[PDB]
Nucleic acid binder design. Structure first.
Length: 98
RNA sequence: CUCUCU
């Protein structure tokens, strides 16, 4: 289906193409001016990420900002959309408890 | 490098 693209979405955005060894400190310092960012995630083995945010309007402005700014991945555009999900969580595996 | 799957 077509459900990859948003139309009335929520607070997690997703990023592709990511740098060779980019860090959370950079990604959150790029989401901080917008609301608070509640979180991020790193699909780092595919060079992809999520960026989850504390307010729907912050993230609407954050994605529209990234549709405006493009912050340039050292010599190419940066590839953003709202997520296939709502509300990111990042807790540890069942093994750690055991 | 389009979604937390390999």
């Amino acid at each position: 289906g077509d459900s990859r693209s948003a139309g009335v979405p929520s607070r997690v955005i997703h990023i592709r193409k990511l740098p060779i060894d980019v860090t959370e400190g950079e990604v959150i310092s790029l989401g901080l001016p917008f609301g608070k960012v509640t979180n991020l995630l790193m699909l780092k083995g595919k060079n992809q990420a999520f960026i989850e945010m504390n307010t729907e309007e912050a993230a609407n402005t954050m994605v529209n900002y990234y549709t405006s700014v493009t912050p340039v991945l050292r010599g190419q555009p940066i590839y953003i959309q709202f997520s296939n999900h709502k509300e990111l969580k990042t807790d540890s595996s069942p093994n750690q408890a055991r």
